[PDB]
Design a protein around this ligand. Sequence first.
Ligand SMILES: [Mg+2]
Ligand SMILES: [Mg+2]
Ligand SMILES: [Mg+2]
Ligand SMILES: [Mg+2]
Ligand SMILES: [Mg+2]
Ligand SMILES: [Mg+2]
Ligand SMILES: [Mg+2]
Ligand SMILES: [Mg+2]
Ligand SMILES: [Mg+2]
Ligand SMILES: [Mg+2]
Ligand SMILES: [Mg+2]
Ligand SMILES: [Mg+2]
Ligand SMILES: [Mg+2]
Ligand SMILES: [Mg+2]
Ligand SMILES: [Mg+2]
Ligand SMILES: [Mg+2]
Ligand SMILES: [Mg+2]
Ligand SMILES: [Mg+2]
Ligand SMILES: [Mg+2]
Ligand SMILES: [Mg+2]
Ligand SMILES: [Mg+2]
Ligand SMILES: [Mg+2]
Ligand SMILES: [Mg+2]
Ligand SMILES: [Mg+2]
Ligand SMILES: [Mg+2]
Ligand SMILES: [Mg+2]
Ligand SMILES: [Mg+2]
Ligand SMILES: [Mg+2]
Ligand SMILES: [Mg+2]
Ligand SMILES: [Mg+2]
Ligand SMILES: [Mg+2]
Ligand SMILES: [Mg+2]
Ligand SMILES: [Mg+2]
Ligand SMILES: [Mg+2]
Ligand SMILES: [Mg+2]
Lengths: 131, 394, 63
Amino acid sequence: SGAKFRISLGLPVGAVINCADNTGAKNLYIISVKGIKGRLNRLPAAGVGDMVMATVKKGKPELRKKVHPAVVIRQRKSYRRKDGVFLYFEDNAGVIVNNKGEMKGSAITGPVAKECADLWPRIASNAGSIA
Amino acid sequence: SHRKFSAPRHGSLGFLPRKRSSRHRGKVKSFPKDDPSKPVHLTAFLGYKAGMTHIVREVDRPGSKVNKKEVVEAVTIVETPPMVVVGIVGYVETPRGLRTFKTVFAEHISDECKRRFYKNWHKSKKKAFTKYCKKWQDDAGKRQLDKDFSSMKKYCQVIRVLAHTQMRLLPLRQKKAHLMEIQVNGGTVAEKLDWARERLEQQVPVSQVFGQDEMIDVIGVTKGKGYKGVTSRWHTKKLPRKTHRGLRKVACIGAWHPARVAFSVARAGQKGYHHRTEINKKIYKIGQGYLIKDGKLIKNNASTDYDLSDKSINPLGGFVHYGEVTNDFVMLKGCVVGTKKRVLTLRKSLLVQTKRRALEKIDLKFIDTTSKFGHGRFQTVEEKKAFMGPLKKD
Amino acid sequence: MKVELCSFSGYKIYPGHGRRYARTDGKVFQFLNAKCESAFLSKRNPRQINWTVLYRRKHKKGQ
RNA sequence: UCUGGGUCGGGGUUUCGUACGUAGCAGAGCAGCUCCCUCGCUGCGAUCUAUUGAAAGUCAGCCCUCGACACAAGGGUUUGU
RNA sequence: CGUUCAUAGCGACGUCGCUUUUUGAUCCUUCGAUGUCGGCUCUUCCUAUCAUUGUGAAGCAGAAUUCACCAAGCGUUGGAUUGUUCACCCACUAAUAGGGAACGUGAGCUGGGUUUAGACCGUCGUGAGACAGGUUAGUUUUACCCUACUGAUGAUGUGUUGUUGCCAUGGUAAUCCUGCUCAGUACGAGAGGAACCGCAGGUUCAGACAUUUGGUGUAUGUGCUUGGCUGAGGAGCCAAUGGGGCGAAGCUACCAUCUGUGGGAUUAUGACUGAACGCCUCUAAGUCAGAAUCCCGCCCAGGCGGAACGAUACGGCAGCGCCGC
RNA sequence: GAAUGGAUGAACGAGAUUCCCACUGUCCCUACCUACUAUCCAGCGAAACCACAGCCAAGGGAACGGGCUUGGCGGAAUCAG
RNA sequence: CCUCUGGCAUGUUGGAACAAUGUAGGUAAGGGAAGUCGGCAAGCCGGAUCCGUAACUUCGGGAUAAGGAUUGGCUCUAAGG
RNA sequence: UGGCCAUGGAAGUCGGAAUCCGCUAAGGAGUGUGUAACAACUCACCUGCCGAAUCAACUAGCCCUGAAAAUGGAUGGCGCU
RNA sequence: AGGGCGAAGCCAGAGGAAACUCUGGUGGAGGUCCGUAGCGGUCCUGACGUGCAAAUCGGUCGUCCGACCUGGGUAUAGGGG
Ligand SMILES: [Mg+2]
Ligand SMILES: [Mg+2]
Ligand SMILES: [Mg+2]
Ligand SMILES: [Mg+2]
Ligand SMILES: [Mg+2]
Ligand SMILES: [Mg+2]
Ligand SMILES: [Mg+2]
Ligand SMILES: [Mg+2]
Ligand SMILES: [Mg+2]
Ligand SMILES: [Mg+2]
Ligand SMILES: [Mg+2]
Ligand SMILES: [Mg+2]
Ligand SMILES: [Mg+2]
Ligand SMILES: [Mg+2]
Ligand SMILES: [Mg+2]
Ligand SMILES: [Mg+2]
Ligand SMILES: [Mg+2]
Ligand SMILES: [Mg+2]
Ligand SMILES: [Mg+2]
Ligand SMILES: [Mg+2]
Ligand SMILES: [Mg+2]
Ligand SMILES: [Mg+2]
Ligand SMILES: [Mg+2]
Ligand SMILES: [Mg+2]
Ligand SMILES: [Mg+2]
Ligand SMILES: [Mg+2]
Ligand SMILES: [Mg+2]
Ligand SMILES: [Mg+2]
Ligand SMILES: [Mg+2]
Ligand SMILES: [Mg+2]
Ligand SMILES: [Mg+2]
Ligand SMILES: [Mg+2]
Ligand SMILES: [Mg+2]
Ligand SMILES: [Mg+2]
Ligand SMILES: [Mg+2]
């Protein structure tokens, strides 16, 4: 119901955020950000809570050499919450996911940002810590 | 050939000759339409941008994720000491336009105001409206005055009051008080005029014009930035590193064959000190100034029902590059045009406001009052004196 | 508006100001300003640093 | 002459992070002298504690002073229905 | 052909056209030189409309759709390979439409490619040498003139001066999307599966701003530290800003925050009354609804265009304003 | 395609490519700072270039006009770009 | 890089400002070559001591391969004539 | 009158050779709709009302559709019914 | 300049029945490596481009005991060197 609000989005296309679920992937080469019309010369950028296409660069060879959807869960670029607290996360991080928002993994190492948790429920269910 | 990859053009043509504004005091380019029905009122005011700060508030837009969640919010303090009406000035409709018809000035006029009428006051003998004010004490003059007012009753349509600021009461350097025509919007012109004739020489405070949680339009001149290149002034792409004759430029001004450079092409020139009328700036707080019943009432500014301390909106060490706001002020949401100290015209909206957001009632929870002259960490001096304890300066 | 305390210095942090850090261990820190946060990230033991609360508690200052 | 604006000073604010000096039974050890006492005394000795959120800067485009000091109708060129 | 049915969509055999974003013809212009491809950057136009608004069509149940109309307001992206144009692939998207401006744009760049001289290879040549055959290395000049544009002083007028104002004319701006709700509802055998009004937000664009987060930082602010140098201490300096922490103010970032509006005429279209044509017809006279259009509004600038009001040279020589003659 | 040398090849190369790690304002996307300029002033003081000149639309015209035709129009003297 | 001896007056001028463009330096959040014909440019790396060192090889090399750790100040000890 | 060819079904009706008589006031061995095929529907001859012209096929005048380009624009301009 | 690598020869010790082999030193080879002066002149396609300059400047670079650099003297002269 209640919609997202924009947040300072510090993952341009070209990032390798570390996969923080138990798949067997280690990295997630963001090749594109979902739901970006975009402008000339401008890199598509995914903050936290953003869907994303993601090649795996290192990990299991099942996953390597193909594209998966993914979600950004933490991010090192400090966004501002509506309550006027800026927040950043120590590492950029995501999870491999399917089109309809379900995880293909099962358990999320590390904390998930609540911008991502509220917007992705199945991620939120497998997230131990939030914010 | 066509440009390969499309892109929307940089900057708006709806804003140009991007030149240094003639005026300093921002003109009200249109007052609202006076319905004749609702009672008489002033449509505009003239404040001063003293400074910014936080607020905190519970928000009540149901549906949002932020419903019943305390957000913070930036705000401008516009110090607005009461204006003095010193004139009225009748207008009449014509097919040519809207001719000024008759200006009746008050009797007594301050040196605050009289300042304005001379380019050099030190050197003048201060002889303005001297033979004028003779009119206000005889049979002949008073009669002519009445006939002028009667004529305005017969003929005029639009009536604007002339008021001016109380430059006296500010922390600014200048004494030369800003005048301004403000339009009286209300009932019939005869009623309209006798209201302004009653208000003559009198104070008018801010609360008489505006009310709380009201969208108003801020009108002013932008913070000026001098000569600026095209990359600053139009936000054109920089060219790359290797460019031989510089790179904060536009490469192709224009095509060959309209063999002129067009008005739509980006060139370097004056950036800033433009006239600009930002609209829909909601008044969160109309704040009561310092006053005396026995001791000072400094509290009445930045105290909220939920805070209850003894603050004023003045932060520690004052608003920077300004002063103390010792007078009544408004507190708009967000930034507004111009610099610190800049004279600023407020104006009631041109527009029938009926959006959820524009009828929202603002209850403030907390005004930040920490210094802006560095990273502040104490809200008030008494709090600081508590936290630190005693210092070597004792 | 729950005023928080700076995880380095000890000062209160009013709603507006400062920054919130969320380490992957899964614990969070609040910093009044960058000055605190830099000393935190460079691993400065705030009890060694005079101007913090933790130092002054340690050295019995005031009282 | 709303006596004013200005310089200096004083507060406030704020930046940095605790000055010099002095004292110490703090100080890894070392030495000189002896009362060869090794807590003897005296010296060297990074650093430490205390004095000390100290010192220092803070409009030059921060805020208030009404404290000290002078200085404030002065000059030149104009223009007429 | 389309089960059936020439024309929903198509369309053979024939035929009539437009177009100059293809390539040819041609050689009128330029050989006392008009800088020869592509990309970047920027502006503007066209429509032969991909999307978006409003609509007619279907072989349109819904969803998806192709066909057509008004229509160019607003958009039309990120990459891999290639010097490329072109091409192709991945990804996102509402859509990844097509062009023009000396095949826009070298005193705007770049110079990868063509296209000197150095060299290699292949084929051809007795050979010098040749090759829209491949390769590698190879100088990208000048603006202070005039205009145009950008901003900047001014100009004639109004007796002089100041004021607060009006407004001729120019410009002009907003965009599209998601989610929730309607609703697993209409529609449909089911599978699937809408829409209007609301509500919450976001894209791109525009205009600001610095409370906050970030950036800068020679306040050369305050520590810390290298080498040297004032006999040492203290206090300092030098090393083209010695180096580095932290850093006020100030600039400043979708890297922070705020704001972005209302009418009128109508177009396509669908209608009314209604003849022409004893009926019927949206039309012939007459009338209605009607839009990302257009015109204005708001918004920016403000005319060899005006306005009301103020004060109008005590003087040491002054000089003027009215009035009447 | 075999001393018009063929195939090879460690070491070496301001030689020609391709990828990876690191690293970065190359870029997303631009921003702030410093010095010397440019700027204004005193003094000093060149050059190239120059038919006349210098606002446009369209027309025709040696088939892309500043000048011609028909329209739009036109306001001293200048400054930085 | 800083200093004494000796030598100079900043390289054919001065002053006031601190705009745009530049020339020469720097710094940048998150990402890290997505830029571009092409990592061009800049950045990383750098000294020393101690470990540790691959493929390949003409057995000489490769080799500072790579990859690691340490480094200051102070007060002592031991070892070298 | 399931007329005949065609069976895959065409008793008027995908198509084609046929193609007349009766009743007749008069209805084609059938214009279509549609059917597996019928059915059902629909398309002359005649009336009832109303009250003088009505209707077809060609043809040529003006006008209109056909009729899409990129700086803003040209019956020469203003304009003109 | 200053460093690096450490070739032959030489010493000792250990093994070997012999052949000889290992280990530690010493030794200081080389159109050897780094790198100054020197000589050069890669890239920035940087600066400059009516220049400082009719080819210069800055950083970045190649080489730096050898087919090394370099003064003076001397030889070769135009279809000739
Ligand atoms: Mg691009
Ligand atoms: Mg296009
Ligand atoms: Mg270049
Ligand atoms: Mg501040
Ligand atoms: Mg057929
Ligand atoms: Mg041709
Ligand atoms: Mg030319
Ligand atoms: Mg069309
Ligand atoms: Mg061209
Ligand atoms: Mg050109
Ligand atoms: Mg060129
Ligand atoms: Mg080339
Ligand atoms: Mg060649
Ligand atoms: Mg000049
Ligand atoms: Mg000292
Ligand atoms: Mg030097
Ligand atoms: Mg119609
Ligand atoms: Mg209508
Ligand atoms: Mg309408
Ligand atoms: Mg207009
Ligand atoms: Mg051969
Ligand atoms: Mg042979
Ligand atoms: Mg051969
Ligand atoms: Mg000419
Ligand atoms: Mg100098
Ligand atoms: Mg000099
Ligand atoms: Mg000289
Ligand atoms: Mg960066
Ligand atoms: Mg690219
Ligand atoms: Mg690339
Ligand atoms: Mg390089
Ligand atoms: Mg190697
Ligand atoms: Mg060059
Ligand atoms: Mg030049
Ligand atoms: Mg010189």
